[PDB]
Each structure stands twice: as C-alpha cells, then as structure tokens.
Amino acid sequence: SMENFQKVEKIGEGTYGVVYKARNKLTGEVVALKKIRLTETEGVPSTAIREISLLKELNHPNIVKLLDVIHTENKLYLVFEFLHQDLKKFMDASALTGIPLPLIKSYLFQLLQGLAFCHSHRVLHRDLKPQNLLINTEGAIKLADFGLARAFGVPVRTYTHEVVTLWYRAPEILLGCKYYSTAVDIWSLGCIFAEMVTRRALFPGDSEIDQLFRIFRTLGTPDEVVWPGVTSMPDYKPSFPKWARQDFSKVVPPLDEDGRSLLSQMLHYDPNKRISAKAALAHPFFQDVTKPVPHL
Amino acid sequence: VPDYHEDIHTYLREMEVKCKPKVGYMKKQPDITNSMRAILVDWLVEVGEEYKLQNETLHLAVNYIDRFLSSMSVLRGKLQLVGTAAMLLASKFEEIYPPEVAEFVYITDDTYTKKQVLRMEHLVLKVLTFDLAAPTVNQFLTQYFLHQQPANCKVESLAMFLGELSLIDADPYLKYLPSVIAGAAFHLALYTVTGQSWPESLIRKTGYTLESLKPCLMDLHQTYLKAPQHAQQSIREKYKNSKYHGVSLLNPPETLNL
Ligand SMILES: Oc1ccc(Nc2nc(OCC3CCCCC3)c3nc[nH]c3n2)cc1
Ligand SMILES: [Mg+2]
DSSP states (O other), rough: OOTEEEEEEEEOOSSSEEEEEEEEEEEEEEEEEEEOOOOSOOOSHHHHHHHHHHHOOOOTTTBBEEEEEOOOOOOOOOOOOOOOHHHHHHHTTTEEEEEEHHHHHHHHHHHHHHHHHHTTTEEEEOOOGGGGGGEEEOOEEOOOOGGGEEOOOSSOOOOSSSSSSSGGOOOOTTOOOOOOTTTHHHHHHHHHHHHHHHHHOOOSSSSSSHHHHHHHHHOOOOOOOTTTTTTGGGGOOTOOOOOOOOHHHHTTTTHHHHHHHHHHHHHHHSTTSOOOOHHHSGGGGGGTOOOOOOOO | TTTTHHHHHHHHHHHHHHOOOOOOGGGGGGOOOOHHHHHHHHHHHHHHHHHTTOOHHHHHHHHHHHHHHHHOOOOOOGGGHHHHHHHHHHHHHHHHSSHHHHHHHHHHTSSSSSHHHHHHHHHHHTHHHHOOOOOHHHHHHHHHHOOOOOOHHHHHHHHHHHHHHHHOHHHTTTTTTTTOOOOHHHHHHHHHHSSSOOHHHHHHHHHOOHHHHHHHHHHHHHHHHHHHGGOOOOHHHTTGGGGGGGGGGGGOOOOOOO
C-alpha cells in the first residue's frame, strides 16, 4: 500500500497525526505523508473525517492539495503535495533583511484567494497561523492543516468554542459569542499581515484576558458605538479598562496608507463590518501585486 | 453572513446532484425493503432525540445510508449496523460533542459489538470515498428561512418537521433533490401557518416556482395529511416538544389550491 513511498524525514506534528516527507519511487514526486494511527479507541477521528471530506472538495492553488488517502485496518495515510517550509520559519530566517513588501503583498493576496475559496465553499479553517501557511521555492503560499476546519451553514449555528490558536483568535470568540463565522479567519489573517510586516506577533497574549487586553490597548476597548451588542456579550465585563484606540500608523509603522487601510478593515471589531476575503482582493493595496519568488 | 450566501447556495446546488443516492436502489436490494428503511430512519430519529443531536446530523446520516445502499447489498439483520455507523460518522462530522462509540454500541442493545461498529464505519467511509460533506434538506431550509417577512418560528419548525418526514419514506422522496423537498416543505409550512405562498425572492434565488415544486408538494401534502396514521411516529412525537413549538399538533390544510 505504502510500498511506492520512500520516507525521507519527519516534518512535524500538527492538529493530529504525524507528517513526513516522502518520495514516490515510481514517479519521482516528493510528497508530505500524514500518518494517523487508528479499533477499541473511538475509530476514525472527527478531525480526520473533516480534513479529508473537506480537502477533497477544495482544489485551489492556495490550498494544500490532498492527492490520495491510503486506508488500512491499522493506519490511515493522507498523501499531500509537498511544500518546502512554513511562514513562521521563513519569517525567523528573514531576521535581518525583513520581508520585501512585494512578497508580503503577494503572500497576503494569495492567502486571501485561498480563504475566499474556503468560505465560498462553506468551510471555516479556524486555525490560521504562520506555522500552518506553507511556501514553496516558486513564490506560492498555501493554507494547510485543515484539522480544525469545519463545514458551516447559512446562517451559522453555534460551533466549537475552543477554536483558533490564542494569538490569532478573534475578539468575538474571546468574548463568548454564540455565533462566529468566516470573519474569524479574516481576523487571523489580519494578525498575520501585521506579523509579516513587523516579524513579531501582533497580540502575543498568554491567557484569554491578556489576549483581550492586548487587543483593546491596540484598537481601543470596544463600546456600543464601535460594535453594537458588545456589552451584552457573555464574557464582556463592565470592569474592562477603557483604552483609547491607537492610530494605525503606529501599530505597523512600515505600512503605507493602502496597507493600513486594509489591515484596519481586517481587524474591525464588528464581525459584520469586518472585510471578507472576496472583497479584500479588490483592495487598492493590491493594485501592483506581482508574484516574487522568495529568497530561500 | 450574506457575502457568500449566493456562492454557497450555488455550490450546494451543484453538490446535491453529485451526492444524490440512486433513485431506484431498493428494487435492487434482495433482502431489504422501503418499510425496513422507514423503521431504521424512525429509530435514528429516536437516537437523535435521546442524545440531543442536531437535526442536521440526522439528515447527514440518512444521506450516508441511502448512498451506501445505492451500491452495497445488505441483509436485514445488518441494516441497523449500517445505520449505527452512519450516525456515528454523521455525529463526528457535525457535532461539537459526538456520543462515544460505546454509547452507539449500547443503543443497538448489544445487537452488535464495538469491533463490528468500527469495522462498519471504515467500510462506510470506503464506500462513500470519505465524501461526507453532503447537502441536506436542512441546509437549504435554513437559507430559505432568511426570506421570511417577518420570521415566523412556527413556519420554521413546521418546515423542519415536514422535511424530516420526507426522510422516512424512500418512495417517493428519493426521487426529489434536497433543495426541492426544502422548497415544498417551506411553502407548505408557510401556507399552513400564515396563508402566504412561496415568495418571489426565492424564485429569483432558486429558479423554482410553485409549478416546478408541484410534484413534490403534492406528495408532501399527502404525507402531511396521513402523518397521524403512518406506522412510524417518532418525528411527530419529537415535534410535539416546545423546542419545536409543538408544530406537529397543527392541522394540515385540506387543499393547497395550486
Ligand atoms: O518546515 C517545513 C518544511 C516542510 C513542510 N512541508 C509540508 N508540511 C506539511 O505539514 C507539516 C505540519 C507541521 C506542523 C504544523 C502543521 C504543518 C504539509 N501538509 C501538506 N503538505 C505539507 N508540506 C512544512 C514545514
Ligand atoms: Mg428489496
């Protein structure tokens, strides 16, 4: 079953299972193998059932391609196109150069295409972070690890609360809203945009309240004017400190006017007013977008 | 979030064709019949109630069963095994907290083992090639509900009740697509409660008219009239609950006047 694959090295561990780099001995294709150890447990995990059914539907240049599923009685193996590294490792490596604006713009543009495609196919990713965004030598970036993803309905009902890595987590989740939607993935992407610019996390909280206060000190503590309904949210407290909103030219100083304008629409408090991936693709920030190869 | 409402509906319209079970499969099953399938679906309704599962989970499970049986011959003593594994799959896909495999073993009243349920899960996945994200009557209704002026909780619950009844009876409902059953159920609900009709805004959205819905509507009207006398009664009892506004106690209209 796995006879044509030659393991090369372990890549790492994501939401679930283990991922290896392997090569197909017959075609020469280099692949990423996601191994899932399986009876007497709870059978095939929900994360795997979701990742597979949903990735089979989502064929897009900016979404990691699932090639095959290999399914014995003991092990399940997902065969994915191989990507060369993650954004996080790339940003670490750009320590001294910084990331050229054209590459930031290209990556953001590509990530928004990937995400617009998910959302138009009723899929929420729910774990966007630099570690799950994978790059190749040809300048592509692709959404990966759909282990936390799910299919949603129109309009949404209540889904799992414990979602999105804390630094990338939207305020509506932090505040306990019973409905969250596609706008949570845009929040994450906005944090990532800021991070590609500064090369550090925009909101590195170490607990949920820390995370909220960091967001509040940057964008202002939300009230009923900025975000109708906030004060009625389950985990809103009238005791919250009331910080003034920072001017964005100070949030991400290297960013020019179109950049700051886009970021601010991606980090809007009110999910309803937060920009969609689809609408963001036409933002003026992208007027001169190209596709630079990175500097590996 | 109406930025993608249209993209999503269009895509669900594409996928429901691809996810459709084979209309005449029961005819080709040596050991099982329509009435045996009705018994199973009615039991899954009960399971869904007992464990407080989403209605969407129930609809997905039926889709998985009908698709599985579209190509796989099954003996009557194994139909409940098929159904149990489908419910377990549907729960894993759709629920925040699915029941554990032990709970699924327990509600078959130890008819089957844990090993059998897990092996059947694996078989269902193989046969469906892991393609579990199927459109349902529920997913369409929930979109159609946005077109009410204004929203009516009884319209909603009654439309759900009617869509659910369609699950029980493969003849005739296997011949209708989820979007069509939902349109018929929504119009039927709306007409029953408020006297109003399939809105013009949903003609623009779906392209369906009362004319194109008529075949399904007439079947669903009859199902609705004969519901108190159907051998399977679990959906009617479920829809007596206050959670669904007791809509199953509403009187069906005598005529549709179409
Ligand atoms: O540094 C590198 C070098 C290489 C890779 N390559 C790669 N990795 C994957 O997942 C690996 C996991 C690792 C833990 C977080 C989630 C992703 C893939 N899934 C489909 N294609 C993949 N390609 C990635 C990073
Ligand atoms: Mg038969």
